[PDB]
Write a protein that binds this ligand. Structure first.
Ligand SMILES: [Mg+2]
Ligand SMILES: [Mg+2]
Ligand SMILES: [Mg+2]
Ligand SMILES: [Mg+2]
Ligand SMILES: [Mg+2]
Ligand SMILES: [Mg+2]
Ligand SMILES: [Mg+2]
Ligand SMILES: [Mg+2]
Ligand SMILES: [Mg+2]
Ligand SMILES: [Mg+2]
Ligand SMILES: [Mg+2]
Length: 47
RNA sequence: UUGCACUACGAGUAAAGAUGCUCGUUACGCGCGGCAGGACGAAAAGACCCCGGGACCUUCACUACAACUUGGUAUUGAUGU
């Protein structure tokens, strides 16, 4: 899965851009803390 | 317990140890109290032995499995070297 990261994550990306992580990092650190969301419909909102 | 029954003995004979067959011998019929030699007495389809089956036990019999244990992979991520 691909996460659009709303927060700024060091050596991982800035606001808004989409970045793919190895699925444990995302669901155990990024989604719980609001750093990223899963990319389903957010591309239209960003663009 | 019981196939019967007016169920002797000897020497024989016979599935090789005979109340029941042979040849002899002995013995009136029926009870009662005793004895325990025989009726291969009774009792338990011999525990021995063998054959077939079983059971449980053992183990460096076989094949499995539990348990224990090994690594891979999922759960499972980040950063450096
Ligand atoms: Mg995964
Ligand atoms: Mg008599
Ligand atoms: Mg005789
Ligand atoms: Mg005789
Ligand atoms: Mg006769
Ligand atoms: Mg008598
Ligand atoms: Mg006797
Ligand atoms: Mg007997
Ligand atoms: Mg028998
Ligand atoms: Mg052993
Ligand atoms: Mg293991």
């Amino acid at each position: 899965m691909k996460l659009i990261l709303t927060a700024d994550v060091d050596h991982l990306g800035s606001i808004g851009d989409t970045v793919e992580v190895k699925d444990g990092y995302g669901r155990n650190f990024l989604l719980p803390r609001g750093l990223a969301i899963v990319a389903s419909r957010g591309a239209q909102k960003q663009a």
